[PDB]
Write a protein that binds this DNA or RNA. Structure first.
Length: 252
DNA sequence: ATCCGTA
DNA sequence: TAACGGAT
């Protein structure tokens, strides 16, 4: 199967990703920016318990590390009745220098799919932002408080990877992956590759070309340190769901 | 929690 | 202005 020929390429079988060719990201602040320290709002035990194993996992993965920083933003519990950690990074976002929004809207992106290429593969990358390292100098920006009263735990944690909730993550990820896949595009002139942050579409003129192109794309992604979702993967189909659209016969 | 945008 | 939906 596809899952066994490319074990490195799938979130299921490859372990965590890390885009090794991408230098750790440095996040420039606006000229007048001063650190902001917002106090953590008290969390109910239910929400704390709901969130705890997620925090523990990220610590075990090295994605969260202890720290002490002049920046602090609130951790929110967000619920299905399962709680997930959602950091409110809005006051950090306002203080970070703006970048040009280079991710195309899906309409314009799909306008680049010729009707000549009707064999499709759709892959989405698992925990994409977490594959990009954050430079130690910018890590402090994203600190929050983790207090576990019934374990005598207090202190800040922060991210070593590009974080959810950060206004520039989607754009920075899209740009990083474009740099990492540029050569692939060069080696495969006959293929169409659409990238929308972590959502990929490969289109080919024939099923053979799609099979051979998908193999090469999976191999490339795994080698670069990215991980595709095998569960959601749509491989060499005449019809696929991409970015809310149904792609079929060159339509949509 | 807090911030932004329809009767 | 109260109220809500959606966002972090």
């Amino acid at each position: 199967t596809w899952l066994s020929d490319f074990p490195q390429a799938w979130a299921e079988t490859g372990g965590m990703g890390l885009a090794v060719r991408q230098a750790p990201l440095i996040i420039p602040l606006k000229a007048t920016s001063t650190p902001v320290s917002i106090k953590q709002y008290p969390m109910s035990q239910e929400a704390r318990l709901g969130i705890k194993p997620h925090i523990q996992r990220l610590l075990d993965q090295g994605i969260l590390v202890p720290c002490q920083s002049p920046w602090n933003t609130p951790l929110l519990p967000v619920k299905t009745n399962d709680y997930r950690p959602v950091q409110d990074l809005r006051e950090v976002n306002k203080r970070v220098e703006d970048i040009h929004p280079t991710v195309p809207n899906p309409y314009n992106l799909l306008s680049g799919l010729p009707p000549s290429h009707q064999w499709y593969t759709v892959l989405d990358l698992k925990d994409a932002f977490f594959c990009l390292r954050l430079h130690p100098t910018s890590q402090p920006l994203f600190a929050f408080e983790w207090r576990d009263p019934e374990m005598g735990i207090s202190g800040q944690l922060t991210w070593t990877r590009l974080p959810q909730g950060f206004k520039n993550s989607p754009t920075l990820f899209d740009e990083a992956l474009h740099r990492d896949l540029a050569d692939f595009r060069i080696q495969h002139p006959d293929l169409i590759l659409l990238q929308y942050v972590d959502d990929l579409l490969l289109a080919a003129t024939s099923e053979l070309d799609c099979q051979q192109g998908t193999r090469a794309l999976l191999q490339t992604l795994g080698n670069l340190g990215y991980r595709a979702s095998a569960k959601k993967a749509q491989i060499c189909q005449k019809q696929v769901k991409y970015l809310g659209y149904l792609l079929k016969e060159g339509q949509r």
